[PDB]
Every structure is written in structure tokens, then in C-alpha cells.
């Protein structure tokens, strides 16, 4: 069992986006394949204007500073 500084690890950028566009499609598609889910999202995301990706990259960047804040002592260089 290894769980000392066990902090909170964030997901990927487009992931924070998946949860957002994951119920819409999966909603109209109650039975998507992990491939379709992530692809469809990978498609919309890819299409999502860069200026629109800001909130997501930004959100992750905010909590990132807080994360690596103490994890440094944990897994690190």
C-alpha cells in the first residue's frame, strides 16, 4: 500500500470538456464505445476554437499550481 502525500491528480484538458460534451452525445447515444466517446469529443474539441479552449486549459492550470505545490516533495525529479 503506497499512499503518503496522496494528493489529487487532475485529468486532461479535453477531459474537463468531455464531462461537458459527454452527456449530450451519450445522451442521444445511450451506448457509445470508449472510442466514439473520446473521438466525438476529440472531434468537437479539435474544432473548439482556441479562444474557447482557454477556460479549460486555464481551469486545469489554476488547480495545477495548487497541486504541484506540495506534490513537489512527493513524486518528483
Curated annotation (Swiss-Prot):
**Residue positions where Phosphoserine is found in the record:** 12
Q: State the name under which the record lists this protein.
A: High mobility group protein B1
Q: Which residues bind DNA?
A: 7-75
List residues, modification Cysteine sulfonic acid (-SO3H).
18
Quaternary structure and interacting proteins, as annotated = Interacts (fully reduced HMGB1) with CXCL12; probably in a 1:2 ratio involving two molecules of CXCL12, each interacting with one HMG box of HMGB1; inhibited by glycyrrhizin. Associates with the TLR4:LY96 receptor complex. Component of the RAG complex composed of core components RAG1 and RAG2, and associated component HMGB1 or HMGB2. Interacts (in cytoplasm upon starvation) with BECN1; inhibits the interaction of BECN1 and BCL2 leading to promotion of autophagy. Interacts with KPNA1; involved in nuclear import. Interacts with AGER. Interacts with PTPRZ1 isoform 3/phosphacan.
| N6-acetyllysine modification, residue list | 2, 39-40, 53
- What is this protein's gene name? Hmgb1
> Which residues of the parent protein does this chain contain?
89 to 165 of 215
Return one GO MF term: double-stranded DNA binding
Give a short account of its post-translational modification: Phosphorylated at serine residues. Phosphorylation in both NLS regions is required for cytoplasmic translocation followed by secretion.
Choose one Gene Ontology CC annotation of this protein and give it: membrane raft
> In which organism is this protein found?
Rattus norvegicus
**Role played:** Multifunctional redox sensitive protein with various roles in different cellular compartments. In the nucleus is one of the major chromatin-associated non-histone proteins and acts as a DNA chaperone involved in replication, transcription, chromatin remodeling, V(D)J recombination, DNA repair and genome stability. Proposed to be an universal biosensor for nucleic acids. Promotes host inflammatory response to sterile and infectious signals and is involved in the coordination and integration of innate and adaptive immune responses. Nuclear functions are attributed to fully reduced HGMB1. Associates with chromatin and binds DNA with a preference to non-canonical DNA structures such as single-stranded DNA, DNA-containing cruciforms or bent structures, supercoiled DNA and ZDNA. Can bent DNA and enhance DNA flexibility by looping thus providing a mechanism to promote activities on various gene promoters by enhancing transcription factor binding and/or bringing distant regulatory sequences into close proximity.
Describe what happens upon changing residue 18 to A: Disrupts interaction with TLR4:LY96 receptor complex and abolishes TNF release from macrophages
